[PDB]
Design a binder for this molecule. Structure first.
Ligand SMILES: O=C(O)CNC(=O)C(=O)O
Ligand SMILES: [Mg+2]
Ligand code: NI
Ligand SMILES: [Zn+2]
Length: 331
C-alpha cells in the first residue's frame, strides 16, 4: 500500500504532465497521495495563471465577515459577523493597517506559535465564498473555471441527468483569518490556488482517521454535538495542533505559498489560517473514486449548514433515504 504513514505529498508535474487534469489526479492517487487528505502541486515553471494582478482592487466584497472567537486558545468556535461592503482595494488597505497586519516574526514556525497563542483575542475580517475567477481565459492547464463539472461526472458514471452548476469562488484573507475543521460538501474533493500574497497554513486528518476527529469534536463541543449529529458541517470549530497531539489524533501540516495548488481529497478534514493579505480561488470537483464517499457523507439536517442549490440533486440521487429530512433542514 502506497504512503502508509499518510504523509502530505508534494508534486512537481512537467508541462506535459500538466495537460490532462484528471489523469494527474489519478497519478497522484496511484502514489498514495489521497491517504494524507491533502496534496501540494507546484506548477511547471512555464505555466502562469494570469499575466498580472494589476487591477484586482476593483473586485467587490459584498459581505466581508468578521470572525469572532469564543473559548480557549486551543479549542474555540468562531462566528461570522457581517460587515458593510468594501472593494478589494479597501480590504487590502485594512489588512495592511496596524490593527490587522502580520506581526514581526522569525519564520513560519514562530508565526504559527503566535497564531495559536493569540488568535482568539482578535477578530480578523475575511472575504469568503465570492463567486468568480481570476484565471485568464487563455490559461488552458489547471484553470479552475474550466474543469469538468460534478454533474457531468455523476452523469458519466451513473447515467443520471441532473440540474446544477459548479463554479469557482474567491477568498480574500488577512492575518489570522481562519478556516474551521471541515470536509467538503458531500465529501467532494477541493482544489485551491493561492493567486497572490502571503501564505496559508493547512492542517489535515487522513480520511481513514476522520471519525477520530469527529469523536474528539463531540467531546470538546458537547452542546453543539447534542444540537446536531454532523455539526462540523457548520464550519465553526477550531482545535489546535497541541490539542490534537494531546488526544492522539493523527494529522499533518503544510504551508501553501503564492503560485501553488492544494488538493483536498474526499473525507479529508482540514483547517487553517492565513499569514497576511492574500487571494485564493477554490472549487469542488469529483472523480469516479468519490462516488462511494458521496453516498456515505454525513449531513447536517438541523438547518445551520445551509448550502448551494446544486447539493440538492447530489442528496436526491445518492442519498434518497436522507433526502426528505435533509431538505426540511434546507427549507
Ligand atoms: O481558502 C480557504 O479559506 C478555505 N478553502 C478550503 O477549505 C478549500 O479550498 O477546501
Ligand atoms: Mg479590479
Ligand atoms: Ni475546504
Ligand atoms: Zn447542523
Amino acid at each position: 500500500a502506497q504512503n502508509p504513514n499518510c504523509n502530505i505529498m508534494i508534486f512537481h508535474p512537467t508541462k506535459e504532465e500538466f495537460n490532462d487534469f484528471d489523469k494527474y489526479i489519478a497519478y497522484m492517487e496511484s502514489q498514495g497521495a489521497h491517504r494524507a487528505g491533502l496534496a501540494k502541486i507546484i506548477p511547471p515553471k512555464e505555466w502562469k495563471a494570469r499575466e498580472t494582478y494589476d487591477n484586482i482592487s476593483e473586485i467587490l466584497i459584498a459581505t466581508p465577515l468578521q470572525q469572532v472567537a469564543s473559548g480557549r486558545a486551543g479549542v474555540f468556535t468562531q462566528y461570522h459577523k457581517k460587515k458593510k461592503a468594501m472593494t478589494v482595494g479597501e480590504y487590502r488597505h485594512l489588512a495592511n493597517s496596524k490593527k490587522y497586519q502580520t506581526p514581526p516574526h522569525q519564520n513560519f514556525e514562530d508565526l504559527e506559535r503566535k497564531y495559536w497563542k493569540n488568535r482568539i483575542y482578535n477578530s480578523p475580517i475575511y472575504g469568503a465564498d465570492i463567486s468568480g475567477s481570476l484565471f485568464d481565459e487563455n490559461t488552458k492547464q489547471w484553470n479552475l473555471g474550466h474543469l469538468g463539472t460534478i454533474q457531468d461526472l455523476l452523469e458519466k458514471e451513473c447515467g443520471v441527468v441532473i440540474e446544477g452548476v459548479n463554479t469557482p469562488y474567491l477568498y480574500f484573507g488577512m492575518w489570522k483569518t481562519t478556516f474551521a475543521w471541515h470536509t467538503e460538501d458531500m465529501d467532494l474533493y477541493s482544489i485551491n490556488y493561492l493567486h497572490l500574497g502571503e501564505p496559508k497554513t493547512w492542517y489535515v486528518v487522513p480520511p481513514e482517521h476522520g471519525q477520530r476527529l469527529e469523536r474528539l469534536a463531540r467531546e470538546l463541543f458537547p452542546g453543539s454535538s447534542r444540537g446536531c449529529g454532523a455539526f462540523l458541517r457548520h464550519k465553526v470549530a477550531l482545535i489546535s495542533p497541541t490539542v490534537l497531539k494531546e488526544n492522539g489524533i493523527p494529522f499533518n501540516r503544510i504551508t501553501q505559498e503564492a503560485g501553488e495548488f492544494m488538493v483536498t481529497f474526499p473525507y479529508g478534514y482540514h483547517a487553517g489560517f492565513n499569514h497576511g493579505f492574500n487571494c485564493a480561488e477554490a472549487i469542488n470537483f469529483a472523480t469516479p473514486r468519490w462516488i462511494d464517499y458521496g453516498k456515505m457523507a454525513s449531513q447536517c439536517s438541523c438547518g445551520e449548514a445551509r448550502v448551494t442549490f446544486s447539493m440538492d440533486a447530489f442528496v436526491r440521487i445518492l442519498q434518497p433515504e436522507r433526502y426528505d429530512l435533509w431538505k426540511r433542514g434546507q427549507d
